[PDB]
Amino acid sequence: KVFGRCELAAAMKRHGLDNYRGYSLGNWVCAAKFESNFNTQATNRNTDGSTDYGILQINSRWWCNDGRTPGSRNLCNIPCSALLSSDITASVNCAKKIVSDGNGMNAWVAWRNRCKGTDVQAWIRGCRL
Ligand SMILES: [Cl-]
Ligand SMILES: [Cl-]
Ligand SMILES: [Cl-]
């Protein structure tokens, strides 16, 4: 599923991400934009052989199992394929664990490089939330 911007903002809001660990909703929408272009089916292979999955490009190196990332962990206790669903529940629940891990949203390289410190409120402008 390719979410509309406000569609995803509303989905993220109802799933409890607005100000989760102090990150306003626009931060999450911005991260999703640059990680996946709002596409739940986004996947990308990393140089180390792990793969990023879904709307927030969650990495099999640590967070999910895909059976093809040797020596990795599965800290969200989920198949990586669950992170590709049209329903963002699994991705959101796992994201909550990731952002609580120590470095906050810096865990998402695209957030650090493209969202952090910017006017992220613009990402939820005009949205019915
Ligand atoms: Cl957009
Ligand atoms: Cl915001
Ligand atoms: Cl933080």
Curated annotation (Swiss-Prot):
Q: Which cysteines are joined by disulfide bonds?
A: 6-127, 30-115, 64-80, 76-94
Where the record annotates domain C-type lysozyme, the positions are: 1-129
Instruction: Identify the EC number(s).
Output: 3.2.1.17
Q: Which residues form the active site?
A: 35, 52
Q: Does the keyword Signal apply?
A: yes
UniProt keywords (A-Z) are:
Allergen, Antimicrobial, Bacteriolytic enzyme, Disulfide bond, Glycosidase, Hydrolase, Secreted, Signal
Q: Misc remark for this entry? A: Lysozyme C is capable of both hydrolysis and transglycosylation; it also shows a slight esterase activity. It acts rapidly on both peptide-substituted and unsubstituted peptidoglycan, and slowly on chitin oligosaccharides.
What is the protein's given name?
Lysozyme C
Organism field: Gallus gallus
